[PDB]
Write an enzyme that holds these catalytic residues in place. Sequence first.
Site, short mmCIF file in Angstrom:
data_model
loop_
_atom_site.label_atom_id
_atom_site.label_comp_id
_atom_site.label_asym_id
_atom_site.label_seq_id
_atom_site.Cartn_x
_atom_site.Cartn_y
_atom_site.Cartn_z
N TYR D 55 0.42 -1.01 -0.31
CA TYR D 55 0.01 -0.42 0.22
C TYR D 55 0.59 0.72 -0.18
O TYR D 55 0.04 2.38 -0.71
CB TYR D 55 -0.94 -0.03 1.58
CG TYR D 55 -2.18 -1.12 1.10
CD1 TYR D 55 -1.81 -2.42 0.93
CD2 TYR D 55 -3.48 -0.38 0.74
CE1 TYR D 55 -3.21 -2.60 0.81
CE2 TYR D 55 -4.53 -1.18 0.58
CZ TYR D 55 -4.60 -2.41 0.67
OH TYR D 55 -5.60 -3.01 0.56
N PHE D 75 -4.45 -4.76 13.33
CA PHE D 75 -5.13 -5.85 12.93
C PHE D 75 -5.94 -6.65 13.63
O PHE D 75 -6.61 -6.67 14.01
CB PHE D 75 -4.41 -5.83 11.30
CG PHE D 75 -4.54 -5.91 10.15
CD1 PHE D 75 -3.81 -5.22 9.25
CD2 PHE D 75 -5.52 -6.69 9.74
CE1 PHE D 75 -3.70 -5.15 8.14
CE2 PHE D 75 -5.94 -6.54 7.65
CZ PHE D 75 -4.44 -5.35 6.95
N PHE D 141 -10.81 5.73 13.09
CA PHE D 141 -10.76 4.49 12.88
C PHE D 141 -11.13 3.79 13.69
O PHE D 141 -12.08 3.29 13.50
CB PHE D 141 -9.51 4.52 12.24
CG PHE D 141 -9.47 3.16 11.65
CD1 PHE D 141 -10.30 2.36 9.87
CD2 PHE D 141 -8.56 1.54 12.40
CE1 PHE D 141 -9.97 1.63 10.21
CE2 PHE D 141 -9.08 0.50 11.85
CZ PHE D 141 -9.62 0.34 10.38
N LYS D 169 -10.56 4.16 4.41
CA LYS D 169 -9.41 4.00 3.21
C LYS D 169 -8.64 6.58 3.53
O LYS D 169 -7.55 6.13 3.64
CB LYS D 169 -10.39 4.83 2.00
CG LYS D 169 -10.93 3.81 1.89
CD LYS D 169 -9.85 2.90 1.89
CE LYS D 169 -10.32 1.46 1.68
NZ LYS D 169 -11.59 1.20 2.54
N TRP D 286 -4.18 -6.92 -3.60
CA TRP D 286 -4.03 -7.97 -1.77
C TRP D 286 -5.58 -7.67 -2.09
O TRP D 286 -5.86 -9.19 -1.23
CB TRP D 286 -4.24 -7.11 -1.03
CG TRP D 286 -4.47 -6.84 0.83
CD1 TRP D 286 -3.81 -7.68 1.31
CD2 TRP D 286 -6.16 -6.35 1.26
NE1 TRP D 286 -4.44 -7.26 2.55
CE2 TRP D 286 -5.71 -7.15 2.35
CE3 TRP D 286 -7.04 -6.25 0.64
CZ2 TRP D 286 -5.98 -7.40 2.98
CZ3 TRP D 286 -8.21 -6.13 2.24
CH2 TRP D 286 -8.36 -6.70 2.77
C1 LIG Z 1 -7.58 0.80 5.96
C2 LIG Z 1 -6.56 -0.88 6.01
C3 LIG Z 1 -5.81 -1.77 5.45
C4 LIG Z 1 -6.17 -1.57 4.09
C5 LIG Z 1 -6.74 -3.12 4.03
C6 LIG Z 1 -8.48 -3.09 3.61
C7 LIG Z 1 -9.23 -2.47 2.20
C8 LIG Z 1 -8.40 -4.17 4.80
C9 LIG Z 1 -10.47 -3.78 4.48
O1 LIG Z 1 -11.02 -5.17 6.01
P1 LIG Z 1 -12.75 -4.64 5.20
O2 LIG Z 1 -13.42 -6.18 4.12
O3 LIG Z 1 -13.11 -3.09 4.30
O4 LIG Z 1 -13.68 -4.92 6.68
P2 LIG Z 1 -13.25 -4.05 7.53
O5 LIG Z 1 -14.66 -2.83 7.67
O6 LIG Z 1 -12.24 -2.74 6.51
O7 LIG Z 1 -12.38 -4.32 9.31
C10 LIG Z 1 -5.92 -0.18 7.86
C11 LIG Z 1 -6.56 -0.70 8.90
C12 LIG Z 1 -6.86 -1.74 9.59
C13 LIG Z 1 -7.90 -3.12 9.22
C14 LIG Z 1 -7.75 -4.15 9.79
F1 LIG Z 1 -8.76 -4.69 11.25
C15 LIG Z 1 -9.05 -2.98 8.40
F2 LIG Z 1 -8.89 -3.14 7.85
#
Ligand SMILES: C/C(=C\CC/C(C)=C/COP(=O)(O)OP(=O)(O)O)CCC=C(CF)CF
Lengths: 297, 295, 284, 295
Positions: D55, D75, D141, D169, D286
């Site tokens: 990323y 995470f 977040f 995002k 990803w």
């Molecule tokens: C935006 C981040 C990473 C990008 C990877 C992505 C697009 C993760 C997206 O997981 P999602 O399917 O959207 O379910 P979510 O509501 O976000 O939990 C860091 C945020 C950390 C997470 C870990 F839990 C969120 F997914």
Amino acid sequence: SLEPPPSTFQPLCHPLVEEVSKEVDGYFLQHWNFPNEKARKKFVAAGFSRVTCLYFPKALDDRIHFACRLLTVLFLIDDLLEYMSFEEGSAYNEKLIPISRGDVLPDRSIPVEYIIYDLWESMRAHDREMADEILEPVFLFMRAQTDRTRARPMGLGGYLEYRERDVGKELLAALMRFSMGLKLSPSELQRVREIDANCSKHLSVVNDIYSYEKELYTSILCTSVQILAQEADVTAEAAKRVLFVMCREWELRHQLLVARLSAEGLETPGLAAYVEGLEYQMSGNELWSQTTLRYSV
Amino acid sequence: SLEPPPSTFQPLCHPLVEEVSKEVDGYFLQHWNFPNEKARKKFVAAGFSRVTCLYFPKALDDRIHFACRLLTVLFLIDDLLEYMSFEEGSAYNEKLIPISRGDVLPDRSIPVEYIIYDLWESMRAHDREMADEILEPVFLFMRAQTDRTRARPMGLGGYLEYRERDVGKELLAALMRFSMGLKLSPSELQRVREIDANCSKHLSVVNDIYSYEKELYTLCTSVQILAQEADVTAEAAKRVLFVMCREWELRHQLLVARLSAEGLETPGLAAYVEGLEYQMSGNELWSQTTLRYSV
Amino acid sequence: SLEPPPSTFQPLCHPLVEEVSKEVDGYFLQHWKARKKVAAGFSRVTCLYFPKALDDRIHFACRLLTVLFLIDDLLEFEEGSAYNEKLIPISRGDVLPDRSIPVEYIIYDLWESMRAHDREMADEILEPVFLFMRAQTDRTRRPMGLGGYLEYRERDVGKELLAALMRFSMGLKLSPSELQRVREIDANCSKHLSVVNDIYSYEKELYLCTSVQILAQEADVTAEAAKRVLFVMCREWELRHQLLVARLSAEGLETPGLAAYVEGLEYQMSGNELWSQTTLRYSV
Amino acid sequence: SLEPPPSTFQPLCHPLVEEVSKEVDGYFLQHWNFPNEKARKKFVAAGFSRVTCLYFPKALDDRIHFACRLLTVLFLIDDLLEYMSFEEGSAYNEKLIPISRGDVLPDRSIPVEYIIYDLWESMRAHDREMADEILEPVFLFMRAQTDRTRARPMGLGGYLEYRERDVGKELLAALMRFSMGLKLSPSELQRVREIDANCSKHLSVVNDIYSYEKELYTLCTSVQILAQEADVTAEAAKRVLFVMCREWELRHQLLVARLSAEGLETPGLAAYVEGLEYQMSGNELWSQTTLRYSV
Ligand SMILES: C/C(=C\CC/C(C)=C/COP(=O)(O)OP(=O)(O)O)CCC=C(CF)CF
Ligand SMILES: C/C(=C\CC/C(C)=C/COP(=O)(O)OP(=O)(O)O)CCC=C(CF)CF
Ligand SMILES: C/C(=C\CC/C(C)=C/COP(=O)(O)OP(=O)(O)O)CCC=C(CF)CF
Ligand SMILES: [Cl-]
Ligand SMILES: [Mg+2]
Ligand SMILES: [Mg+2]
């Protein structure tokens, strides 16, 4: 509980309600293949003929029974369809359609088949021309009884526009015209288009208000109560109240449109009697929605 | 005309209204640059401090003037933007933002600049800690005063959710917390998140109801929207929306009690939630009287 | 940049197109500027739409369209509904046309010739046609999103006028019992015709209600960008059409008449596209 | 199966990817209380630091580890939240916030508590200014991880408008600027509003395209919404949506050119918009490979 807001409209029943109820109910009790006795008591308790008289109070004395018979069988067939599959039901009614047109003789051994053929034959005898007029509205309805609902996000506006074309309400307006001997011309109907849309909307929301508790048992929910609650973010009860005021606003608008229709010298005797009948469907539908056991948990 | 449905919320004007009026109104009657005299007269009638006293009744006696000041200048600025463009206006306020933080100096020859500077220095002086808490809220808001509406049709639901985020009603809540010396902790504010949205939504619709006529002369308002979706007149739509506001009022109370039943809530929130209640009834009275919605 | 994505639908043209075109055009261009162009390809569209039309009925369709197309737009006081409404009774034959006003005896003769070839089917097109004519002369709207618009177009009248006119052209007799079996396929088809139409007529209609403007706003991209997305969506409906036809067959509900009907709907979609691209009606 | 349409963007990984992983992995491998062994095995499999380098492939060599640590803990915390109620998780993270600010010392005996504290203490130590610059984005977040989604009828446009505001995002963009050493002024950020919204939609939809099946067990995604408004299968909706994503990639390039042609592009914004491009390309790879969406 829920309190209905003030209305200038009031429910009325057809004068011969008791005589017709007995007649029609009697016919079906001896001709319709009812399961057991508990079923025959459940049928009388329903009083389909009485329901019909509450919807078409201004129906001619010698026609109101046709409507009671028509709705009666439609209500019965609707119950049967509940225990059938779209394929089964679709085929079931699609068969009764040619029998309704009278293009296919019924198998006298099957109740529903001769009851239908007889009902329509009887109707064409009383008024061939008008009897034919309600053939389409009825089939359109029958076919819809087994149609698969396509789920898609719908806001209040979309929902209400969808109900404006409800075939069940379209059936009621066309059946009502028959029971009243009102042969409205093409120009006269196109003249009350807004009135019809407004009314059909009224009838449907009132049904949604009282049928909510029932539908909310999902063990495919399409109702204004659910939609208004989520959009305004309030409880279903809160939505019911709001929706009820909206309905009074539709009663008002009805009176406005009726006043306008006349002020423009377009209110012929028929439309006068027609838009009045509609007023009673709205008030009648409301009392019904408040009592019918169909909406009972 | 329109008869508002029954409410259990009652307005309340801040006691010092008349004094803070003479005060603040005077400060601007000599510092702020008014065209002629007609401008001043009208200004007096507008009674911005009165307007502020109606929204922040429970405001600390020694802080109500601050608010009256903050909103009088914004009301004033906002009016000037009606003659500026999106480029001109965006910069106008964009310039005042730094000076507001104190990081820049106010050209003393420029009224609006030192007034904003003096205004803030004064605030951080009374409560540095809280005078800052409302820095972003004010800015995010000021920049909003010059944005361009986007091109997407909104239904009732979309419009309402959109009003739940209204930058203005957000400024009010924050300016109220400041006027009431309520230092809410992050864990608390979130606990009243639904309460803030329901309220912001309430304030916006009441505004729509009374501002419809005005706006109608050329629109993003709950009145036109519900009128089109329900297919009724704007008037009928107002009546419906008003009843809807009563439901939000009843919901507010439930969001309040529920907040204590599942764990009683601190004096701060308990006080804040009440302040919000007054803005609602306050806004209603204002909307029915402010000449801003007159033709 | 508009490169139509791949499509398995292959458009057909009526072999008598050339013959009928001059035949039909030569008509109105006698009973009706310095310009008149033709370049539009009216009888040409009809031939792309109903390639399987009966050789002796193909000219009827070209005439009904060559007139409906000269009306939809061209000759059209934003409520000259009196113009159209004054042509419905004539269409039914309940009123005689003034040999002076072309648009009148053109309709009369036209319909009188259609009944004389086949009354039953000629009367069936009446309503579908009036409903089209009665439709749009300005009476439309509230807030319209993508789903609302597509749902709205699933029930488009013109799209309903084509299926009606098509059955008459091919001499296809269908009962409501059979038509009811193909409701989904019709809705789908109607969408495809409308969105393709919207894609190529965006410029002309813009000189409003159109999927191009809506998608552009909801996705926040340019009109051209929206056109490309909408095109891919049309290819999906084409796939759905095939799947629906496959189902109709397997569900044992397919009948010869229906088998011809669906395939014909496919022709209208593929034909509608080829046309929309070439027709100088939208200024290619 | 699903063939991605043509794209002018390409995924990219960070050079120090191998070293950072080792480093970040070992750290958590000893400080984080893994239930057993089955967990540590899974943990390494995830490759959290490897995801980060995908990323933020243009992150400064001496900063990329700050990102990996930050995401890793987020995470992990996201996973533990899965085993907590809304009230539980809300209070859990609500505690780590005052700790992240460095305002409250950690209970050195509770891993998650001192791992957060130290991380932020570190970041400030490397760039106090920018470190504080991303505190709010992270907290916005965290507080969203335990939010109750309000269900309401939503069309494509509504859903997309909503995703433009996606807090996640927003976090990636903010975290990216931090990792790249890009201190953007308020004027610069305001200058790339459209670009950010466009990109935010892209990342969100590509996610939906690949998380559909996953979420399709026994609710709010562009896949179900488009499929329903167009009356096509979810699979078809995904193909349409993918094309739309390429359109957004095109929009991104045109917005950058215009932003440049108008002389509005600065050296900082240039590096930022390119960083977002790789955020979109990376996020796509990803989405196709993370096991978070599998089965
Ligand atoms: C935006 C981040 C990473 C990008 C990877 C992505 C697009 C993760 C997206 O997981 P999602 O399917 O959207 O379910 P979510 O509501 O976000 O939990 C860091 C945020 C950390 C997470 C870990 F839990 C969120 F997914
Ligand atoms: C429509 C009428 C007769 C038609 C015969 C039948 C069976 C009508 C019942 O069909 P629906 O009621 O529309 O499905 P629903 O119960 O609402 O989920 C007269 C009144 C019946 C109503 C039923 F809703 C309401 F007016
Ligand atoms: C939150 C504030 C006042 C609350 C009272 C309200 C609703 C003020 C209304 O501000 P507007 O966005 O212009 O809506 P309007 O069409 O003028 O009625 C600060 C005053 C701010 C101004 C400019 F934002 C002055 F209008
Ligand atoms: Cl663009
Ligand atoms: Mg046209
Ligand atoms: Mg067009």
